[PDB]
Amino acid sequence: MSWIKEGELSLWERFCANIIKAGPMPKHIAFIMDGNRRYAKKCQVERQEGHSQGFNKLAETLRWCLNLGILEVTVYAFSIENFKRSKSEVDGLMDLARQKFSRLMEEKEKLQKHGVCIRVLGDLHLLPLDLQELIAQAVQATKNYNKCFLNVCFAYTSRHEISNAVREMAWGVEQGLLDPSDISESLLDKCLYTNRSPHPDILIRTSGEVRLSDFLLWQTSHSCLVFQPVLWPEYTFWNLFEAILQFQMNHSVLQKARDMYAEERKRQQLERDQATVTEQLLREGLQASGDAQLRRTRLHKLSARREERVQGFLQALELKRADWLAR
Amino acid sequence: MSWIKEGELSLWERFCANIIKAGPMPKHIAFIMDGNRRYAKKCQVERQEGHSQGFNKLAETLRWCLNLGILEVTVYAFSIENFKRSKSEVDGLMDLARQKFSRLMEEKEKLQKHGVCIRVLGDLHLLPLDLQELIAQAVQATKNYNKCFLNVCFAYTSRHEISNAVREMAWGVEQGLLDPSDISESLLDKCLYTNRSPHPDILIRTSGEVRLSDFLLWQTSHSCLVFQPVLWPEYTFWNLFEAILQFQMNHSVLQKARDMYAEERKRQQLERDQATVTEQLLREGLQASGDAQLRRTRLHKLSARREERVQGFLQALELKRADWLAR
Amino acid sequence: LAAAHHRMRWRADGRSLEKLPVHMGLVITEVEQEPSFSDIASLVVWCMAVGISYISVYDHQGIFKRNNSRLMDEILKQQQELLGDKDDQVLNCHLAVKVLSPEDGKADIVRAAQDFCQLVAQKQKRPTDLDVDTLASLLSSNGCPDPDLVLKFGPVDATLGFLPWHIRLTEIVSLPSHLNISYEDFFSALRQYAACEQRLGK
Amino acid sequence: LAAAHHRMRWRADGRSLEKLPVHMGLVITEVEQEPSFSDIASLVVWCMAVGISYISVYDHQGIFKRNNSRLMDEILKQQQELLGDKDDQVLNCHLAVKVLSPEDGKADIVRAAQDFCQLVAQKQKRPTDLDVDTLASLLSSNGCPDPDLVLKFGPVDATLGFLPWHIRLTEIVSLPSHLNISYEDFFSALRQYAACEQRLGK
């Protein structure tokens, strides 16, 4: 009935947790909670019962994560594609969501005592107006909490998120807050729904599917990918433990690759900027280098002016995003 | 009668030498042996006697330098401008030079026992043909010795040296061994008469004049400048010691300035090359950067091809310079 | 005539599967040694032989993008030996084979965002005119289909910046190494993709 | 009318010396603090007041070349106060004052060598046509006279890359600091240059 189970780890779980916590631990784990309906059929129960147990496992898995010191979790809860299912199933899912978000506001203050921040990411205008208001309440209430973070991807796809982010930047140049040349990989990051969290360390999908189904495609480009056969309502602490173990075995090569990518992107951005400065300096008829350090000044100004327009764009984008949440 | 005096240092000279040798010592000292005629007038002797004592002091000062472990010395012995003096004085100087270079070949082998290399730099085609042959003999004989180095600037000016160096590089592009864009500060260094020695650490001029009189202008741009009032025939070990002391007090700021200059020149050369690569890449319609690392390859090739033409030019320039010395 | 039999056998293999990829991705994560170009070329030639239209070769260090001629030469060499007129063979491999590196992913989405924002600044487009499909058309993929199967070779459990936008439904099959890869191993991955069930959210 | 008396006094000072520099160089070697622009401007204004035609301001870190407007503004400010129509005053200081850095030395000789070698490559010149005078004409000095006096300020006993080619006969007078430099100190250096004997090798 609540959104986080209150239970400590058993001996073997505690013991193994202490062991792996001697190595690199994930700061952020993302889940694709897949396999509910197959689980319902395997246990000879209705599909709403499968989905209902699926939510219970989400509350259980968050307690495992908090006990493991993993304080940020993102979950795929409802895809835009899931709107294509039968009205009976979609209404069943909408009703389950109405019920848990309503119990969430009743279980408030218990959200203060643990500092849990609830973020709900997606094209939320596709949801029923009432469910939107329940979502907005929960989001507005748990803002300014910082002890842990749960991002619920509801009525979400990654392509819709990436498209909206580009629309945001296009709004920036339309308003005069951005030049088209300011658009960058780093700037698109900050226009995603997930812009207040770091990219996931691990992406876990259950049920044995080896696809991503339009989930955090931008964000998991360098995440550890763990595809586990177990059905989501049957997820155990040890499935989660196995996934973290996978991440620890991948960590050294994943971190080097993450850093080589970042270093290469900054190197190429510098080459492009120097070439821009050189093109302008080839025009005007000025020297490409010299003791006056003209190109060094124009490089600093080109960058500083870019960071200034970007910071102004982001402040306006955050004011617009708080406005819709306030109403 | 010889070109180097055989004498050890006295106690106080030895003691002070050991002291300063605990700090940075000059590897190369250049002398402007100025004041001979004023010394002749002060001692009421003929000017040839002043010049003759001037040579004796040169032989004495070289022994001081060898005892101090300063193994390379450059001296201004005769300026192209000195040809404008009276025939009586010029003939007197030419005769003194004929006599010492002739005694030098008689005192050969004693040049082997000390590995002394004699180089005579200048526009030597202005000297009498016989004196040229004496010079060429001494130079050809002491080649391949490496225990110490004396560079005698005879019929020399710096502007004539810098002009000849530029003519050499122009010869390179005429022959097809060089592109005009290969011309650089470093390349001009290697076309000077002094190209087989490092730039002087100290420039000493005697007699109280505070000018350079067209001597090692390129080479002493970052040398320690020591102008000493004493007349050259009166130079003492302690004048030399005072000059080294000046160099040691200047060394930290002189070395930082030398290095900041070198670092800045290489930085600007890299900017120019990157801009060249960018101009070519703007033409042809190719990208200014990308994962193919096209500009990184073109930068390496632009540089490697430059170093290849330069090395080929220098080998030909050294073959031509050995040919004239052989004849 | 022997090569004609092999051509038939390979085409019969591809036709026998419940479904075949139209666009195959090869992601090489092994960084111990430089990749085996002859092994990569063999995977590519098998893809063409069994009937896969497009093949994208990817490594996150850009090694294949910086050794494009070596790879094509090896592909053309083995394709000729299997298919027993070089220009048409060259053009065919250039139309079917694309060598990719990280810049083809996120950096290309950024390039498209710049192109669209430039149209907004010219009053030629509105920010609201950029839906999911218009952005898809703006990418460097153009008309080519998204990869439906990716073979990931190596010990790294990651896609490492491979067409983020295009792999929303791509099946990701993992093999331990591309070195000395066997056709049986390659075809077993095709059988796995053939057996997968795609529900598209329903 | 008070400024007219000062103008007369300064001109009478310059005319009283046995000789006056046509082109004065100011080499600042002090690197402890940033140079005092008002002190530098005062040296420059005194040079103009006593009758020196050209003044070159030099520091080996390029500080003056990167602060050209600050220096001119300070020069124009003090020149107006001493000389009691801003465009003509600005043009006059631009014709008399040149701010230099190391690139004006060796790097400019290299630029001239490139220009000449480019003519050789175009069959427009022969390597033998480059004597001492033609190279002098190729430099960025053009028609301006070489410095005959350099005032070197600071504790460094070096020229630090100041017009190597142009200082073949320049007299190098050294002062300990440009900070709070007095006119008497500046004029004593002029007296020293006035007293020097130039024999030109004879």
Ligand SMILES: CC(C)=CCC/C(C)=C\CC/C(C)=C/CSP(=O)(O)OP(=O)(O)O
């Ligand atoms: C956030 C909240 C309060 C509720 C949402 C979270 C819950 C309980 C369920 C998610 C809904 C779906 C479709 C999960 C995918 S499993 P599936 O339906 O695809 O089953 P299958 O893969 O076909 O076996």
Ligand SMILES: CC(C)=CCC/C(C)=C\CC/C(C)=C/CSP(=O)(O)OP(=O)(O)O
């Ligand atoms: C290398 C060799 C064997 C001989 C040459 C070295 C000797 C002995 C003399 C150098 C000749 C001159 C002109 C020295 C300058 S002093 P000055 O003539 O300018 O006298 P001044 O400055 O007028 O007092």
Ligand SMILES: C=C(C)CCOP(=O)(O)OP(=O)(O)O
């Ligand atoms: C809420 C979730 C987990 C949506 C993704 O799972 P799907 O079941 O909808 O994706 P497909 O297997 O149909 O591709």
Ligand SMILES: C=C(C)CCOP(=O)(O)OP(=O)(O)O
């Ligand atoms: C051989 C030498 C030392 C020539 C330089 O001294 P000079 O005496 O000829 O130079 P000036 O003082 O005449 O300028």
Ligand SMILES: [Mg+2]
């Ligand atoms: Mg599913």
Ligand SMILES: [Mg+2]
């Ligand atoms: Mg003299």
